[PDB]
């Protein structure tokens, strides 16, 4: 009857879900949980999601948890505002961009991961690899955006941008200065940051919290 | 006109693609590359896939690389033999299982990862965590299979099994003894191993190569 979504601030998988709902204009109920207070580990969550993770989503009797699965279900259940074009060939490219975004987590966020799981423990001999790998990954997306001149997969907003943008917003959040090193991504970020649905779904805790600044040196 | 797939032995993302093609009975051309000889890094591959990875797939003018994207494209382009049921609610569960399989790589394969990236370097204090985490992850799937009594998402073979099985076959390949600890997964594995399409797509190099045996102690 009416989708309900349990989610938390700062979580790209949660953001993906909110963006799809907003873009498709679907009315939904929500429960903003507290990560710092471990509410994603509550019994109400576990009943619906034995992994005790967010997002956890329900829609009538339907219950779905994996962020990507939720997005796919919403696109299929509410076809009114399609986040995929109709041409099968073009759709293939949207799917390609969507799933390729996972490489950003691995190749880029690992630079932020390492600068924490053992910080104050120099190893710039290897650290060079990671930072360099982050630059290589970003290069791909820089090119993609350069090629489209608009969004990440086509000249129109699609499911691919739902997956991509949150990752870019997170990167900027960590203090990355993309203006001159990655002009197209920066331009993409600025355009998207002005999109009403994105404005509505910015992570609530970022406004009053300081940027961790783990990518201030990325460049 | 006729799909063409570049792929390598032992790669779950490649296996996923071959299974979809075989299950849907789509006729395709193929180029079996050599990982040990770095043919996935060839110029012919790079032209199609700048990441120099496999699987790389083409179908006429369409070019798609991400394994999941390839599978989605095939399901959409060749609807004759659907790997998804028609009911949107049930499809949601198939999507859920498909994407949740990624946790197996992270929670289970990490036990195999660690027992290599720094083997002969005891740390059973932490090692306990990893092994234990692998058991927790497998528990979920044990339950799922217990609940269905058949396949991983429903009582019918679906896209979810395409994603799941390769990961289980890999686990067994590493020497896991699931018979008594995870009876339903073992039963699932045996049934699937007898499925003609799986028989046809077993990783070619496994027959004459010894099992790495990194999960012989998992139990």
> Which CATH number belongs to the domain containing residue B210 in this structure?
1.20.1050.10
**Is residue A73 domain-shared with residue A93, that is, in the same domain?**
no
Residue B5: strand, helix, or coil: strand
**Is residue A117 domain-shared with residue A184, that is, in the same domain?**
yes
Separation between Cα atoms, residue B128 and residue B22, nearest integer Å: 40
**Is residue B175 domain-shared with residue B198, that is, in the same domain?**
yes
The answer to whether B11 and B22 are in contact (CB under 8 A) is no
Separation between Cα atoms, residue A176 and residue B63, nearest integer Å: 32
**Is residue A84 domain-shared with residue A67, that is, in the same domain?**
no
Torsion sign over Cα A71, A67, B160, A48: negative
Domain hosting B15: range is 1-79
Whether omega before A37 lies within 30 degrees of 0, making that bond cis, reads: no
**DSSP character for B171?**
H
Residue where a domain stops, chosen among B57, B79, B101: B79
**Is residue B124 domain-shared with residue B70, that is, in the same domain?**
no
Separation between Cα atoms, residue A178 and residue A167, nearest integer Å: 14
According to DSSP, the residues that pair with B58 across neighbouring strands are B4, B63
How many structural domains does chain A have? 2
Residue where a domain stops, chosen among B79, B109, B137: B79
In total, the C-beta contacts within 8 angstroms joining chain A to chain B are 74
Question: Which residues, at least 6 apart from B58, have a Cβ–Cβ distance to it below 8 Å?
Answer: B3, B4, B5, B48, B64
**DSSP character for B33?**
-
CA end-to-end span of chain A, whole Å? 47
Pick from B218, B99, B108: nearest CA to B152:
B99
What is the CA angle A31-A32-A33, rounded to 5? 105
Tokens 């990518």 correspond to what residue? A215
Separation between Cα atoms, residue B101 and residue B85, nearest integer Å: 19
Q: Has A147 been labeled as part of a binding site?
A: no
**Is residue B27 domain-shared with residue B90, that is, in the same domain?**
no
What is the CA angle B1-B4-B8, rounded to 5? 170
Tokens 């009797």 correspond to what residue? A61
**Is residue A19 domain-shared with residue A67, that is, in the same domain?**
yes
Question: Which residues, at least 6 apart from B25, have a Cβ–Cβ distance to it below 8 Å?
Answer: B80, B81
Mutation target among A96, A109, A152 for the B interface, most CBs of B within 10 A: A96
| A4-7 vs B4-7, strand pairing mode | unpaired
Two tokens, residue A152:
């990440």
Nearest CB partner across the interface for B95, out of A72, A91, A96 = A72
The answer to whether B35 and B9 are in contact (CB under 8 A) is yes
Two tokens, residue B102:
């990624």
Separation between Cα atoms, residue A153 and residue A141, nearest integer Å: 10
**Is residue A132 domain-shared with residue A180, that is, in the same domain?**
yes
Provide the CATH number for the domain around residue A23. 3.40.30.10
**Is residue B209 domain-shared with residue B124, that is, in the same domain?**
yes
Cα B22 to the center of its chain, rounded Å: 14
**Is residue B114 domain-shared with residue B216, that is, in the same domain?**
yes
Q: Has B86 been labeled as part of a binding site?
A: no
Residue B23 is inside which H or E element, if any?
helix B12-23
The phi and psi torsions of B57 (rounded to 5 degrees) equal -135, 140
- Structure-determination technique: X-ray
Residue B4: strand, helix, or coil: strand
Separation between Cα atoms, residue A136 and residue A111, nearest integer Å: 13
Question: A72: how many CB neighbours lie within 10 A of its CB?
Answer: 24
Tokens 């995929």 correspond to what residue? A84
* Yes or no, beta carbons of A64 and B99 under 8 Å apart: no
* Yes or no, beta carbons of B88 and A99 under 8 Å apart: no
Query: How many Å lie between the alpha carbon of B77 and the closest alpha carbon of chain A?
Result: 7
Chain B interface residues facing chain A, Cβ-Cβ under 8 Å? 50-51, 61-62, 64-69, 72-73, 76-77, 88-89, 91-93, 95-96, 98-100, 103, 140
Residue where a domain stops, chosen among B31, B59, B79: B79
**Is residue B85 domain-shared with residue B154, that is, in the same domain?**
yes
CA end-to-end span of chain B, whole Å? 47
The answer to whether A50 and A44 are in contact (CB under 8 A) is no
B76 neighbourhood in chain A, CB within 8 Å: 88, 91-92
Q: Has B187 been labeled as part of a binding site?
A: no
**Is residue B75 domain-shared with residue B129, that is, in the same domain?**
no
Which residue pairs from B154-157 have beta carbons closer than 8 angstroms and sit at least 24 positions apart in sequence?
Answer: B154/B85, B154/B90, B154/B93, B154/B94, B156/B85, B157/B23, B157/B83, B157/B195
Question: Is B17 buried (19+), middle (13-18) or exposed (0-12) by CB count in 10 A?
Answer: buried
Residue B145: strand, helix, or coil: helix
The answer to whether A102 and A140 are in contact (CB under 8 A) is no
Separation between Cα atoms, residue A146 and residue B23, nearest integer Å: 38
The phi and psi torsions of A29 (rounded to 5 degrees) equal -95, 165
Separation between Cα atoms, residue A135 and residue A67, nearest integer Å: 27
Separation between Cα atoms, residue A22 and residue A71, nearest integer Å: 12
* Cα B2 to Cα B29, B57, B59, distances in angstroms: 7, 11, 6
Separation between Cα atoms, residue B42 and residue B64, nearest integer Å: 17
Question: Which residues, at least 6 apart from A66, have a Cβ–Cβ distance to it below 8 Å?
Answer: B95, B96, B98, B99, B100
Mapping DSSP onto H, E and C, the string for chain A reads: CCCEEEECCCCHHHHHHHHHHHHCCCCCEEEECCCCCCHHHCHHHHHHCCCCCCCEEEECCEEECCHHHHHHHHHHHCCCCCCCCCCHHHHHHHHHHHHHCHHHHHHCHHHHHHHHHCCCCCCHHHHHHHHHHHHHHHHHHHHHHHHHCCCCCCCCCCHHHHHHHHHHHHHHHCCCCCCCCCHHHHHHHHHHHCCHHHHHCCCCCCCCCCCCCCCCCCC
């Amino acid at each position: 009857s009416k989708p309900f979504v349990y989610w938390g601030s700062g979580s790209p998988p949660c953001w993906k879900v909110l963006l799809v709902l907003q873009e498709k204009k679907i009315d939904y109920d929500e429960k903003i949980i507290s990560f710092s207070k471990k509410e994603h580990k509550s019994e109400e969550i576990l009943e619906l999601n034995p992994r005790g993770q967010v997002p956890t989503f329900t829609d009538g009797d339907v219950v779905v948890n994996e962020s990507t699965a939720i997005c796919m279900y919403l696109e299929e259940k509410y076809p009114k505002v399609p986040l995929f074009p109709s041409d099968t060939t073009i759709r293939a490219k949207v799917y390609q961009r969507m799933f390729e975004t996972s490489n950003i987590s691995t190749n880029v966020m690992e630079f932020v991961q390492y600068k924490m799981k053992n910080k104050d423990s120099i190893d710039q001999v290897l650290l060079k690899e990671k930072k360099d790998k982050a630059h290589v990954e970003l290069g791909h997306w820089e090119n993609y955006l350069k090629q489209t001149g608009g969004f990440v997969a086509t000249k129109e907003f699609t499911m691919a941008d739902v997956f991509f943008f949150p990752m870019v917003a997170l990167i900027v959040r960590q203090g990355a200065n993309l203006k001159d090193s990655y002009p197209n991504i920066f331009k993409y970020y600025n355009m998207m940051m002005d999109r009403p649905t994105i404005v509505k779904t910015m992570p609530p805790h970022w406004a009053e919290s300081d940027s961790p600044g783990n990518l201030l040196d990325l460049c």
